[PDB]
Design a protein around this ligand. Structure first.
Ligand SMILES: O=S(=O)([C@@H]1C[C@@H]2O[C@H]1C(c1ccc(O)cc1)=C2c1ccc(O)cc1)N(CC(F)(F)F)c1ccc(OCCCN2CCCCC2)cc1
Ligand SMILES: O=S(=O)([C@@H]1C[C@@H]2O[C@H]1C(c1ccc(O)cc1)=C2c1ccc(O)cc1)N(CC(F)(F)F)c1ccc(OCCCN2CCCCC2)cc1
Ligand SMILES: [Cl-]
Lengths: 221, 233
């Protein structure tokens, strides 16, 4: 696989190059957010195909990872955009919401997204770290619920775990490079991966409130 | 907070709760109601021991009573589930709820929506077996779930969060120490730390799905039990 041969610096360059653009909301809250999310999803599919290791998977496994990860990926993008806007969520440059506007439908999810944004600000999360985390969410979120037990599904799981190890090495490289001690490198890697557990929780609560792209995702692939 | 990695391991190993038995001789085969009854009874007894264990996790009693209950409210089902997965590791294809309650996949079907959670728990047990998860690593992970699960959903609140993040950094140092001691290279140490923490995201998912399936078919209880824990001889 090409992925497993990349250095830390090449993995970061590939992921930075694959970054989708920040979209605007069209010139009702759910309507505006659905329209924005629908446009972001088309870019997310094309971004996913550029994450090293992702296109080495079967179509079926690519769709499963996207089905499991799509809301977590929208949410980490939102939190990243909102970082320099304490108390607000920057859905788009023309759709900056504060807590009060959560009340429209959602306030609980808003509060959890605001807390994540604060955590990233407090940690001084870097763009190189952000693109690594977003790639981890894509590969990790669905890896434990692959249904099959064929030789091919075992090889797919193994491949995903190897790419996840490459992204871990990349995060450690970025931290070493910034001059963190070995202890600081391991502590910061832990703090970043522990935030992924909160993003999973926010995604699940989001869906609970709602009750979505179907296994739609295949055609789009 | 001033402890060594070696002392952190000793404290966590020493604080481990006991393994409980299921209610003896229930009517077998099970119905939906009688399985849910057995599991509710076991979980209710395990909760008393979880509170006692939580009070011995370094840093936990430094929090306010309100913040202790908030962490337990957020973490209790994840903690029951990682204990189940740990007990089940030496029983491929089965979940060891108790030494006298070993279930295979098919029994999950008795309760609607439970077979999906069973399958996810069996996959986690396989992942731990494949990684050769060690007891000293398991007690570290269980402590991380307690301190991490509720920390982001708690005001000069800021001091409590800072304290929890420092204790979490101490448990990370402890995990790395255990891996170093075992003879893993620096690369292997960081990869294994990442693989263990990435499984916590799947345990969170299983916990959320568990609750969703329940409501398809708490703070106050935990506060009384925590309050009452101060009155225990
Ligand atoms: O979890 S949410 O609050 C969700 C997060 C944020 O706000 C909602 C929203 C969104 C996303 C997709 C949509 O189609 C519509 C809205 C968000 C968004 C949009 C674009 C982003 O770049 C980033 C985030 N949420 C609330 C509800 F439960 F009340 F409905 C929800 C909505 C729809 C779902 O499907 C599942 C959950
Ligand atoms: O997620 S489960 O599969 C869940 C996993 C496994 O099996 C179920 C079960 C369990 C746990 C607790 C029980 O009371 C009964 C059963 C397990 C277990 C038991 C002992 C273990 O050592 C390890 C695991 N599940 C059912 C579904 F899948 F069918 F939907 C489910 C059931 C009940 C739930 O909460 C009940 C509210 C109780 N509160 C009330 C407020 C105060 C705090 C307590 C949440 C989810
Ligand atoms: Cl657009």
């Amino acid at each position: 696989s090409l992925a497993l041969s990349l250095t830390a610096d090449q993995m970061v360059s590939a992921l930075l190059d694959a970054e989708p653009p920040i979209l605007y909301s069209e010139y009702s809250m759910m309507g505006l957010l659905t329209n924005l999310a629908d446009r972001e999803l088309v870019h997310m599919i094309n971004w996913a195909k550029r994450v090293p290791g992702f296109v080495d998977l079967t179509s079926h496994d690519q769709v499963h990872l996207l089905e499991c990860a799509w809301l977590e990926i929208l949410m980490i993008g939102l939190v990243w955009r909102s970082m320099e806007h304490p108390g607000k969520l920057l859905f788009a440059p023309n759709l900056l919401l504060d807590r009060n506007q959560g009340k429209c439908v959602m306030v609980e999810i808003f509060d959890m997204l605001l807390a994540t944004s604060s955590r990233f600000r407090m940690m001084n999360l870097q763009g190189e770290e952000f693109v690594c985390l977003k790639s981890i969410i894509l590969l990790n979120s669905g890896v434990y619920t692959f249904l099959s037990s064929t030789l091919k599904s075992l090889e797919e799981k193994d491949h995903i775990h190897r790419v996840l190890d490459k992204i871990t090495d990349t995060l450690i490289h970025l931290m070493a490079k910034a001059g963190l001690t070995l202890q600081q490198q391991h502590q910061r890697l832990a703090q970043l991966l522990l935030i992924l557990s909160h993003i999973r929780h926010m995604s699940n609560k989001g869906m609970e409130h709602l009750y979505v792209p179907s296994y739609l995702l295949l055609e789009m692939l």
